[PDB]
Target: CMRF35-H antigen
Amino acid sequence: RTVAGPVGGSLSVQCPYEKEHRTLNKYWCRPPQIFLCDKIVETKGSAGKRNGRVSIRDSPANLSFTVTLENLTEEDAGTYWCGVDTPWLQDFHDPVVEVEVSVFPA
Amino acid sequence: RTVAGPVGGSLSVQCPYEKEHRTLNKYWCRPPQIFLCDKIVETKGSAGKRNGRVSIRDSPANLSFTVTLENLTEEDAGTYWCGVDTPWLQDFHDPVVEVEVSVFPAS
Amino acid sequence: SKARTVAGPVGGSLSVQCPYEKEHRTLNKYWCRPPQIFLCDKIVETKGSAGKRNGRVSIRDSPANLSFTVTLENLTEEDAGTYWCGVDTPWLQDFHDPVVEVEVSVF
Model:
């Protein structure tokens, strides 16, 4: 998926998932070179739900979660994964929506 | 996931998988390293279902398979992979569930 | 594991429900205060030497519904506290993460 916002602006991405995933850890990360991606925020694991300009909120009742990036900078752009964390060692084998972030001039 | 048992005792470990994997070879292997992980037991592969004190049994109805260790020894402890042998290209290799096996004193 | 609080009145028959997943279906299901060291003292269990019924405690597995139930009769203040809705391999004493960590509160 592709999403775009202006520098200084904000963006949110909604990522859907299936009913059995309601209670699983939900996360946001860049695609890794190792099995585990470096989770920027997550709903249940140790990254925390908020880290600086990035936050994550799960809405099981709608079968989706939303990642929000505040005060965008050019560095925020790029490929990300929004994932639901399943038993697999590698996050690649989770249900993942790939999200491509663009950041344009304000 | 960690499963543990006493020296001389037994344990079994469950390894979940996806519906797509029901018909695939399942395995149990040590070291957790791609290519170097040697399959101790497999459900279809030539390692066989039982290799000494270890066996494997698949239950596609519960989307998991179970590895059993008997007569545990200290050397049985370590990190293992429960693996699904997927016959297609994967950028991060076969899907695996990582299991820490621990052995505690025999009571 | 998952966390559940189960509350009921003193002298009541308290019904603790412990859901689980498909991988746990065939496992022994148990009730116990969490382990002092490695393993807990199984109060009741569905597939073990402990028995499904002992004193005011009894257990019933409902694998079709991916849940088991522990019933506490004649609930007292001393019953409050932390417990494991535990799982292990039938007829043996191995360590698995419990499926539910239960807090019993008595009012």
Remarks:
- The interface with chain A takes residues 1, 16, 32, 81, 90-93, 95-98 of chain B (CB under 8 Å).
- The domain at 1-107 of chain B is CATH 2.60.40.10 (Immunoglobulin-like).
- Chain B has no helices and nine strands.
